[PDB]
Design a protein around this ligand. Sequence first.
Ligand SMILES: [Zn+2]
Length: 258
Amino acid sequence: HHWGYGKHNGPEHWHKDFPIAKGERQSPVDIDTHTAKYDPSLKPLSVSYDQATSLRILNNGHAFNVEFDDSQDKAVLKGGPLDGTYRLIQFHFHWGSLDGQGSEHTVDKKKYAAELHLVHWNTKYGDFGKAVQQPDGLAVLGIFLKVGSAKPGLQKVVDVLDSIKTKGKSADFTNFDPRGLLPESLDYWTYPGSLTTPPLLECVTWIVLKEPISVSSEQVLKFRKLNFNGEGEPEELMVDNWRPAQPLKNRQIKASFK
Ligand SMILES: [Zn+2]
């Protein structure tokens, strides 16, 4: 009855309801590291999450969102390719059924186990809904996950997942520090793209970090116990909730590093 990540409603079908799926600046893409251009004029990336106020975690039937208070400039992304100030509104992940798949962006065709998206909106547009209608409305910070050592800063998220197993379930999720999800280095690639889920709006500056974070097999296994379905419905494990790479078309990926 609507969009998802199965054979019958997955990414290959989305263009019928959302023709922009075949548009000029769709995401994700493959990042060909030997085609990206170092840009020495890119300003340093500024992640300012000290005053972040998390509120709630929600299973929306596609992923889970950790939501933040974005009523003021409490957690912001600036610098790099960005003009102005972008406010953190939520983060979520995309992940696979197996460790060898799950990311949306790929790097020289390599798929990672998962990908974290920290979603920010351009404050010059006043609200998120207006921002998504602008070509520079959003900035999404993308971070790859590989399976190795546990990420301590992820554990609070993992442990609450039992309480939001099914579509529509939410739980209080205050006092979470998203700085615990970042890698050491802020080296990145950047390109103009889109939301990777319907409505696939072409409003995103993508900033994808080069350094993955490591999470444990046990942590990702717990992501994979979530459900796409609602309570009291036949179980559909929430896995493989990623859109594959889309054609780059008339775009350039810039690198912050050589
Ligand atoms: Zn996403």
